[model samples]
Every structure is written in structure tokens, then in C-alpha cells.
Target: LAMLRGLSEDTLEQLYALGFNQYQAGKWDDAQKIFQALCMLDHYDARYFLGLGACRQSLGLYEQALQSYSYGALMDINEPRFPFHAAECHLQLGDLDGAESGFYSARALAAAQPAHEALAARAGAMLEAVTA
Candidate 1:
């Protein structure tokens, strides 16, 4: 607790190192706990929520992972990968509509990060009309 008293002066690298070390140890729960603390302090943190989502995904908490990715995307609308993962989660949950919506939004968000734009866009256009 004493170490936390000066949180107002802590560096971002400090927090990331601590959290990443927990993650590297396969301590998903511990990493999540630390990451949640870090996220509560900063809201515009897509990376934090991404880490949390992956941790939840590993725990078989797909819904929670999707929601975490939701928060990540909310923090960074330019991030298409988060929504893309949410779409995958929705697909696993059998919510085809949600999956379609996610794909559509992700395709649009990929305008700037065009690493997979053309392919994902074409795919989304195709999936938009399909049921499965």
C-alpha cells in the first residue's frame, strides 16, 4: 500500500512491466487483476483491455473477453482488431447478427490500418449477406 501512495507519480513503463511480468508467468488471473488496476487509472488504454481480453479468453471466459475487447475498441475506435475479436466471440456464441455487425464495423475501422483491409473488407461484404 505504501508503494501505491505515490501512484500519481508512477511511470507508464513501471505499470506495464509489472503487468507484463505477471502475464509472462502464465498467471492470467494475476495479470488481469493488475491490469484492471492499471486500466481503472487510465481509460484510453486499448492495450490494457486487449491484455485483459486475452487473459479472459484463455480462461474460457469468452463473453468477458468480448466485453473487454469492446472496452478496448471504445477506447480506440481506430482499432479494428478488437472488434474483429469480438466478432469471433459472437460467432462462437452463435449471434450471427452481432458477428456481422462487428465485421462491418471492423472493415470500416481498418481504413487507416490497412494491413488486412482489402481482404477483410471483401470478406465482410460477403458475410453480410450470409447467415452462417
Candidate 2:
């Protein structure tokens, strides 16, 4: 929290903070706005795009969310959020190739967080169950 206090509001920190807060509170629309604002501030932050994807996912915008997460994955292979969310979007959209690619990228970053690693591992293990 002190680390956040040190960051300038003009930077991406505020946007990320806002988006994360809104997401945790289940305010999807507000989260989307915050993340989208962050993207405008720094389009390179994969985390911002990942949050945007999550917001879109909540809105039933699967394809758009996939596009956002895919962009994030292409930008940074280390951000599991992008590929993980992309995989979710792809699975819902019935895009096997896209989902598989996303899963691969996400799995590579699972080592960054153990709990999420389990979630990602589960997603990977269930890939074979996708019908289309």
C-alpha cells in the first residue's frame, strides 16, 4: 500500500488500482472504465489489458476480451493474466486453436503465482474436454 502511495496519480498506478478495486468489488463496468483508461495511459501494461479482458468477459463480450488478452500475451509472455483470460474467452467462443495457444502461454507464467498456477493447471488439464 505504501508503494502505491509513492506512485504518481498521473502514472498507470492509479488506473490499475482503480480497476483492481472495482473488479474485487464486482463492479465490472467501473472496472472496465478504469482499465480502459489505463490502456490509454500506457498501452504496454499487460495487466491493464488483462483486467480489461476480465471486465469485458463479465459483459459477455467474449471476442473483444480475447482480442485484448491476446494483445497482452503477444506483448508479454510473462503475464499469465492475459493468456489465462484469453484461454477462457477462446473456450467460450469455441476457438480451439486460440484457446490452446493462450493456455500454453498462460502455463508458462503459472510459476509466478502458485494458487493461480493451480487454476491455470486445471484449465490446461481440461483442454481436451473442449468440444469444438
Candidate 3:
């Protein structure tokens, strides 16, 4: 898809690595820029949105993070991490209802994949924490 859009896969991978490195180095702004470009380059890849959302969330941009995570979730509904992170953003934004709903979605989605059982349990735990 990226090749069809005039973007090289190697270039996209390099950008993703750069974004992740920036994120690990606590350079949220730089990571956000790279991830944003990656998202535009390949809108079908949920990882780009997830990286963007993580950068935004780290920078305390909860609303923007939520939007990114929402798009990531839509891009890959089976990926529980998107909704899980979205729930965290909702909690930060003081949206208890949204947080609960997101946690529930994450839990259900994670539960469907055997490899994500741990994430399913974690989401369930977070749901309990929020409701308690």
C-alpha cells in the first residue's frame, strides 16, 4: 500500500524506528511528528496510530491521544492495546464512563486471542479498579 502511495517500505520502517527511539528517549514531540507522518504514509497500519497516541499521551495531550487511539482501534479492532491505552487517556481526562467502556472493549477483544490472555486479565483488573 505504501509503495502504491509512492512511499518505500524501507523508509517507513526507518521512520517507525526513529519514532520509537524518540519515544524511548522521552522526546514526545519528535516521536509525535514522526508517528504522525507514518500514519499519513500508511493509514492502514495501527502501529503508527498507537505510537502517535503514546507520544500524545506522554505529552499530556489526552484528547489527541484518545483520538489517535480511537483511530488505531478502528484500524484494527482485534488489537486490544488501542482500547486499553484509550481507556488510560479517558481516565486521565476524567471520563469515567468512557474509561469503563474502553476497558470493557479491551478486555473482550484481548480475551478473544489466546496470546493476549495477559492483556485480557490486565484490562479486567483495570475495569475493576475504575468501577471500585
What's the TM-score of every candidate structure?
0.72, 0.75, 0.90
In model 2, which range of ten residues has the least summed lDDT?
1-10
The true-versus-predicted C-alpha distance at residue 6 of model 1, in Å, is 4.7
Top TM-score hit? 3
C-alpha RMSD of each candidate structure in angstroms = 3.9, 5.3, 2.8
Give the clashing pairs for model 3. none
Candidate 3 per-residue lDDT over residues 27-110, each given as its tens digit: 999999988878777647877888999999989999999999998887687899999999999999989999999999999989
TM-score order, best first, reads 3, 2, 1
lDDT of 2 by residue, 3-107 (tens): 333345566676688789999899999999888777775536777887888889999999889889878878786767777678888878977888887777676
Residue 66, model 1, lDDT: 92
**C-alpha positional error of residue 43 in candidate 1 after TM-score superposition, expressed in Å:** 4.6
lDDT of 2 at 96: 83
| Stretch of 10 with least lDDT, candidate 1 | 1-10
Any runs in candidate 2 off by more than 4 Å, and if so which?
A: 1-11, 109-116
**Per-residue CA lDDT of candidate 1, range 1-132, in tens?**
324433543575578678888888889898888777777765456778877887787777889989899977877877877877787788778788888888777777765665867747665764666454
